[model samples]
Target: VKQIESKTAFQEALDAAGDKLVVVDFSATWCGPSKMIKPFFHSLSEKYSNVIFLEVDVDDSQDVASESEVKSMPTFQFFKKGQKVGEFSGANKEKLEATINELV
Candidate 1:
């Protein structure tokens, strides 16, 4: 469970991940949508050892927002083998777990 505070720190995490599944939660402080699922993400981060769950506060780290092309709040990105597999935006907790299960 890690909260990425810097763009370089995020990149370092990705490089450290290598072939592992790195899931990123592009959250924001004032985004109402991100509020509900923050705990869900932290829970997943603790439950899964095979995956790298990182929370990127969009408000705290602005560069990464544009760096990753995030257009909205509560966005999620999946990476594997050093490439982005896909991304989606939503606030459904069940759907988030299911997607992580499917990807992992």
Candidate 2:
């Protein structure tokens, strides 16, 4: 898992993605749903290397969360070429993977 610590790093991550897909996982340690999906996200990262998997602690990176308008925990925003194409905010692994696979 990659930790996005600042807005500059976030932009760099997007640039590093190139033509590949970028999955930004917005979460906080205090959120139950975020904890529940943590392992699943790790599994997916191990399963797919072509896609970039990033974790942004909303509590720590308030600017990124605020800009993204993430109102809940465990929210995933899929990006392609630095543009958001899809998002999911819940604990459903199946639905999350489906959306990600569809986007990829």
Candidate 3:
């Protein structure tokens, strides 16, 4: 998964996604749920190379989080062709997997 650190990089990734599936994980350093799902998220990246996986630290990139309207930690936003198609918040692995399967 790619770690997004700046607003420029965030926009670049979204623009570059084209018609592909993009998964952006908006998390924070002090978030426990985010830590819990790190391994699972990474495994998903390995399993789904066709999809773009991005990790954005809310504290590191406040502008990106605010622009994405992420009000909570570990917010998983799914996009297709640069448009947001779905989103979920928290550390629910089953739900996340279900959403990914449904989208992809």
Q: lDDT of each prediction vs. the true structure? A: 0.86, 0.89, 0.90
Q: Residue 77 CA error for candidate 3 (Å)?
A: 0.4
Which candidate, 1 or 3, has the higher lDDT?
3
| Model 2, C-alpha of 50: deviation from truth (Å) | 1.1
In what order do the candidates fall by TM-score, top score first? 2, 3, 1
**How does model 1 score by TM-score?**
0.91
Scored by lDDT, model 1 comes in at 0.86
TM-score of 3: 0.93
After the best TM-score superposition of candidate 1, give how far the Cα of residue 67 lies from its true spot, in angstroms: 0.8
lDDT of 3 by residue, 27-100 (tens): 88799999999889999999988889999999989998998899798999998887899998999999988888
Q: Show pairs that collide, candidate 1.
A: none
Best by lDDT: 3
Per residue, candidate 2 scores C-alpha lDDT tens digits across 1-104 of: 79998889998989888988988899999999899899899899998788889999998999999888998998999999989998878878998788778885
Q: Give the clash count for each candidate.
A: 0, 0, 0
Model 3: number of backbone collisions: 0
Task: Evaluate residue 2 in candidate 2 and report its C-alpha lDDT on the 0 to 100 scale.
Answer: 95
> 2 or 3: which has the higher lDDT?
3
Candidate 1 regions exceeding 4 Å error are none
lDDT of 2 at 82: 85
Candidate 2 stretches with Cα past 4 Å from truth are none
